[PDB]
Amino acid sequence: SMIAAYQARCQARVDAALDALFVAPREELQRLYEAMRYSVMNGGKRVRPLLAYAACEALGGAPQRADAAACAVELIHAYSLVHDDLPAMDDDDLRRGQPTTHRAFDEATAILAADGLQALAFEVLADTRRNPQEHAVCLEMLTRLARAAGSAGMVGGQAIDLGSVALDQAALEVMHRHKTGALIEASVRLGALASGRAEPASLAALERYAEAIGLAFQVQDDILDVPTYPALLGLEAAKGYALELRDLALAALDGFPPSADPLRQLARYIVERR
Amino acid sequence: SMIAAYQARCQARVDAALDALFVAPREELQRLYEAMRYSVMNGGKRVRPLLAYAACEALGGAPQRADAAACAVELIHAYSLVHDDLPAMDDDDLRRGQPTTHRAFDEATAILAADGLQALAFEVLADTRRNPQEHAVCLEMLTRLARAAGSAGMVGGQAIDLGSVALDQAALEVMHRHKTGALIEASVRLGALASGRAEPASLAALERYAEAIGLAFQVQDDILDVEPTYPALLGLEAAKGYALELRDLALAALDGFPPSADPLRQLARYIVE
Numbered sequence: 001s002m003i004a005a006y007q008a009r010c011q012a013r014v015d016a017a018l019d020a021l022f023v024a025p026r027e028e029l030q031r032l033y034e035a036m037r038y039s040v041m042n043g044g045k046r047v048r049p050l051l052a053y054a055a056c057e058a059l060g061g062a063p064q065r066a067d068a069a070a071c072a073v074e075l076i077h078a079y080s081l082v083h084d085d086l087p088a089m090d091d092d093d094l095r096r097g098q099p100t101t102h103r104a105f106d107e108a109t110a111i112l113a114a115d116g117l118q119a120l121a122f123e124v125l126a127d128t129r130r131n132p133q134e135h136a137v138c139l140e141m142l143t144r145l146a147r148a149a150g151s152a153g154m155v156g157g158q159a160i161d162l163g164s165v166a167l168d169q170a171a172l173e174v175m176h177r178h179k180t181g182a183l184i185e186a187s188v189r190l191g192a193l194a195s196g197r198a199e200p201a202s203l204a205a206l207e208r209y210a211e212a213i214g215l216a217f218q219v220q221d222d223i224l225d226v227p228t229y230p231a232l233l234g235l236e237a238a239k240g241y242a243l244e245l246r247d248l249a250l251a252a253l254d255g256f257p258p259s260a261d262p263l264r265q266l267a268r269y270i271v272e273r274r
Numbered sequence: 275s276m277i278a279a280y281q282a283r284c285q286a287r288v289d290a291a292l293d294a295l296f297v298a299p300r301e302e303l304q305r306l307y308e309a310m311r312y313s314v315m316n317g318g319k320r321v322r323p324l325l326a327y328a329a330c331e332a333l334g335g336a337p338q339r340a341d342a343a344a345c346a347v348e349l350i351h352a353y354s355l356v357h358d359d360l361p362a363m364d365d366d367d368l369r370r371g372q373p374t375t376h377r378a379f380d381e382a383t384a385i386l387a388a389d390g391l392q393a394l395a396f397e398v399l400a401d402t403r404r405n406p407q408e409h410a411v412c413l414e415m416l417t418r419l420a421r422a423a424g425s426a427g428m429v430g431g432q433a434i435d436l437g438s439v440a441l442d443q444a445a446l447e448v449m450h451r452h453k454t455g456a457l458i459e460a461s462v463r464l465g466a467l468a469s470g471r472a473e474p475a476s477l478a479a480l481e482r483y484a485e486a487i488g489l490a491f492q493v494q495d496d497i498l499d500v501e502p503t504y505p506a507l508l509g510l511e512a513a514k515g516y517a518l519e520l521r522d523l524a525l526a527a528l529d530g531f532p533p534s535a536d537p538l539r540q541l542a543r544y545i546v547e
């Protein structure tokens with residue numbers, strides 16, 4: 001599988017596009033823009049960009065069409081991690097072994113940098129030079145991202161995670177579907193929209209794909225860490241379920257052409273990682 | 275008093291629209307949505323909605339056309355105040371004698387509720403049923419609000435404030451223009467775009483208006499506090515004179531506008547009394 005090569009290509013592409021967004025328009029704003037840059041340019045794997053590019057290719061679009069989509073979903077993702085790391089939330093000093101933004105700078109600056117990243121995400125999609133889709137398509141991208149990022153999506157999931165106490169599998173899945181599923185789903189949907197060849201049946205299929213891989217990731221993460229999927233189902237039964245989720249993802253792409261292979265490969269990668 | 279009646283009408287209208295946005299879609303989200311509601315439905319005067327409605331009317335649009343614009347700018351405003359109140363920012367326990375959101379609920383909840391409000395402001399403008407403008411207009415409204423709300427606007431102003439040091443007037447005005455001026459200017463621009471009649475000249479004139487009133491609000495707030503601030507820099511009498519000069523610049527920007535701009539004229543006068 002060339003998923004590692006595909007991941008590296010999407011990472012490089014989106015990293016170049018993102019890095020160009022962090023130039024302060026005036027000197028008084030330099031430190032804020034530095035905190036924004038620090039919060040995004042942290043060597044992340046850019047899975048949500050990968051998804052946008054791969055969904056766009058799956059429907060036959062040239063990947064560059066999805067550049068704004070890739071940037072927007074990464075910006076949302078980045079802003080959410082900054083807030084998640086804050087003392088009032090997870091109170092993390094480190095993220096992937098490097099100081100969190102509130103430690104590198106200060107708490108007010110982290111809060112603010114991340115708020116500015118959220119606005120930027122929406123700016124990038126509404127900018128018809130950076131996101132040169134048909135207007136109705138740009139508006140649909142923005143609608144979907146705002147719904148996915150907001151209180152009925154990602155932020156909702158963070159609230160559900162914080163508010164939770166024994167969860168059963170159904171409740172764990174509701175939490176995951178909001179906290180990470182919504183934005184994963186939006187990454188796929190936005191890339192699909194960026195293709196210019198979206199239609200309802202393909203969008204629905206791609207939504208099924210995205211649902212399945214979003215959960216697969218969480219199941220396999222729990223397995224690798226060994227109220228978790230192994231605790232709930234048993235270890236070996238959790239491993240089984242990860243395969244079933246991969247299979248649902250692959251089945252959702254039945255009938256898609258070979259250009260959907262990156263999506264297929266990602267589905268396998270998620271459950272094969274050791 | 276004409277302005278008082280106009281403000282009351284805008285307040286009631288936008289409050290009805292806003293209140294309807296805070297219904298949790300499922301039970302696990304109820305407390306979050308309560309915190310969102312608590313943060314917005316707080317008896318605010320709704321100056322930014324007023325500006326959107328009045329700019330729309332100034333260009334001959336029916337005010338209802340600006341309903342989404344009015345919501346969006348108020349949602350931005352509301353979110354900004356929730357984050358500003360947090361312990362790491364202004365650490366404010368009360369706003370008009372009522373607990374701030376982090377006090378009423380908890381800090382994480384407040385952070386999250388406000389993050390959701392920001393997303394919602396964009397959702398409301400991108401929704402073509404709620405914001406039924408021509409699609410190019412919807413996108414321009416969203417572009418302008420995201421620029422005004424973000425790190426080059428409102429958030430930038432908050433960063434300049436934390437980064438500030440005896441400021442001189444010029445530096446104080448750079449701070450104010452970002453921290454509050456961007457969003458005031460966006461409110462006027464979005465209401466003007468909602469009219470369906472915007473043109474480059476009228477937009478530019480309305481921007482000059484908005485610049486002037488945005489600063490006049492700050493100068494007059496400082497004066498009222500007395501009755502690094504405008505009175506401290508200039509002395510009380512000269513700060514008062516400056517507020518009057520800004521009102522004059524605002525009225526001058528409205529040269530040529532029809533009587534439907536009277537609300538804007540009246541607001542400019544109200545601010546400096």
Ligand SMILES: CC(C)=CCC/C(C)=C/COP(=O)(O)OP(=O)(O)O
Pocket residue numbers: 079080081083084090154155156158179180386389
């Ligand atoms: C609305 C906000 C701030 C959302 C955060 C969403 C999210 C994915 C947080 C990380 O989860 P985690 O805390 O379980 O994972 P990590 O180990 O990455 O902190």
Ligand SMILES: O=C(O)CCn1c(=O)oc2ccccc21
Pocket residue numbers: 003004005007045047050266269
């Ligand atoms: O370690 C690496 O740099 C690549 C590991 N990796 C990979 O090979 O494919 C991926 C897809 C998403 C995220 C990570 C992936």
Ligand SMILES: O=C(O)CCn1c(=O)oc2ccccc21
Pocket residue numbers: 275277278279281319321324541544
């Ligand atoms: O007494 C009140 O509650 C409203 C006073 N008020 C008014 O009369 O016009 C206004 C415009 C903007 C904000 C407040 C205004």
Ligand SMILES: [Mg+2]
Pocket residue numbers: 084089090
């Ligand atoms: Mg967390």
Ligand SMILES: [Mg+2]
Pocket residue numbers: 084085090092
């Ligand atoms: Mg965490």
Ligand SMILES: [Mg+2]
Pocket residue numbers: 218221222228
């Ligand atoms: Mg887990």
Ligand SMILES: [Mg+2]
Pocket residue numbers: 358364
């Ligand atoms: Mg403050």
Ligand SMILES: [Mg+2]
Pocket residue numbers: 358359364366
């Ligand atoms: Mg305060």
Ligand SMILES: [Mg+2]
Pocket residue numbers: 366367368369370
């Ligand atoms: Mg107070």
Ligand SMILES: [Mg+2]
Pocket residue numbers: 492495496503
């Ligand atoms: Mg002041």
